[PDB]
């Protein structure tokens, strides 16, 4: 029809947005023509999504942006950056977020790598560390990336949830990040706001509000909570008994299983009782699948083969 299919989809989206925001109705608001400091938060969050797309969970998350602090030489502030040929140190002031530490869900460190056409080596592996207090180890590895030093400028992003989570609970442990060259030759990648000083380095903190703070459809949940709604169902295939097959030597069978049950359009799980993906016509289907190994013969020669998407491990309404 493409008639009801589109309208049922629009209407599911209406309830999905309000549900994810924990709103019972749209909030009756100004209609201005908005501070650019507010648009920058939205612009960075959108852009980060577009970058990660160049490859709790349900409820909406509020996003806060924390820029690299500005340095005033007349003030008594310690500079936010320090420099060695092999690494860079960058520290964010996240003190205004300490009252929200329990609501943190994810934190991203976003820094713009500048093009360095004078770079000697064209590729470098760079590592992100969380600096620790000391005696003891002085840094904790977070992540690493290979970068093209001479390539056109690009945004990089790191998951730094663990480090920021610690900084919000213990201000005394905020010694900043270290962006270091991977050494098993100087650091040849350059970064906006760090080297040579829109492209300011910043943190994106995703928070679940307390008022929103107030079970996957897998074997652990479904097999212990039998229900008519969409859920995993057990099914064992015996190759000889059920298929009449005797050419597979191992395994004699496996629990392929399947997904079955009701998916509503509008010990309980929300993935079973609401329409989380806002489908126009929700259907109970597999979410996570796993491969299967088999050993069979075609005469004298043994064959060990791996077959993808053979075992159903979880379900979803879609």
């Amino acid at each position, epitope marked *: 029809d493409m008639d009801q299919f589109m309208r049922k989809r629009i209407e599911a989206i209406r309830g999905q947005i309000l549900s994810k925001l924990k709103l019972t109705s749209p909030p009756e608001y100004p209609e201005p023509e908005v501070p650019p400091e507010v648009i920058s938060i939205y612009n960075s969050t959108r852009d980060l999504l577009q970058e990660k797309a160049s490859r709790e969970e349900y409820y909406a998350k509020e996003v806060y942006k924390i820029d690299m602090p500005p340095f005033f030489p007349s003030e008594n*502030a310690i500079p936010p950056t*320090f*420099y060695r040929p092999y690494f860079r*140190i960058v*520290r964010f*002031d996240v003190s205004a977020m300490e009252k929200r530490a329990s609501n943190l869900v994810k934190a991203e460190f976003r820094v713009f790598r500048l093009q360095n056409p004078k770079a000697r080596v064209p590729e470098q592996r760079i590592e992100l560390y969380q*600096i620790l207090k000391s005696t003891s180890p002085t840094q904790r590895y977070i992540d690493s990336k290979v970068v093209k030093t001479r390539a056109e400028g690009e945004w990089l992003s790191f998951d730094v949830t663990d480090a920021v989570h610690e900084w919000l609970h213990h201000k005394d442990r905020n010694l900043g990040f270290k962006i270091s060259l991977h050494c098993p030759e100087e650091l040849e990648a350059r970064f906006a706001g760090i080297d040579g000083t829109g492209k300011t380095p910043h943190l994106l903190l995703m928070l679940l509000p307390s008022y929103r703070l107030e079970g996957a459809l897998d074997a652990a949940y479904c097999f212990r909570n039998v229900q008519d709604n969409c859920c995993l169902r057990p099914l064992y295939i015996d190759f000889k008994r059920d298929l009449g097959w005797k050419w597979i030597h191992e395994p004699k069978g496996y629990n392929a299983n399947f997904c079955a049950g009701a998916c509503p359009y509008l010990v309980l799980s929300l993935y079973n009782t609401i329409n989380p993906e806002a489908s126009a016509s929700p259907c109970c289907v597999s979410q996570d699948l796993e491969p299967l190994t088999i050993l069979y013969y075609i005469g004298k020669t043994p064959k060990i083969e791996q077959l993808s998407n053979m075992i159903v491990k979880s379900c979803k309404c879609s």
Partner: nanobody
Amino acid sequence: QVQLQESGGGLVQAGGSLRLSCAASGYISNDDVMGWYRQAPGKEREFVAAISVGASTNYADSVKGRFTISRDNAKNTVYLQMNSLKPEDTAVYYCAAQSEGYWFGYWGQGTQVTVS
């Protein structure tokens, strides 16, 4: 707790060198940032240089290529090597230490530097 004593200042001719040193009396952590500010008479404190984790440094634009900050963690001493001295560098130079917060909280009484 924390006490800072500067020395090495004096009157030099432009183009000459001078080495400042700041001895830290009390307890300072190697993680704690140390640095130098300078205050011309009447004018306000001005960041010059600071040293941090992994002997990492940060320099004011006016002293880049001429000043070197270094640190002897074993004796809790920071040095400021001043080469190619200019009249613009004439000020009282204060050494500073990080207070337990990301700001300079401890200050020595300062040493004069005059460049002819």
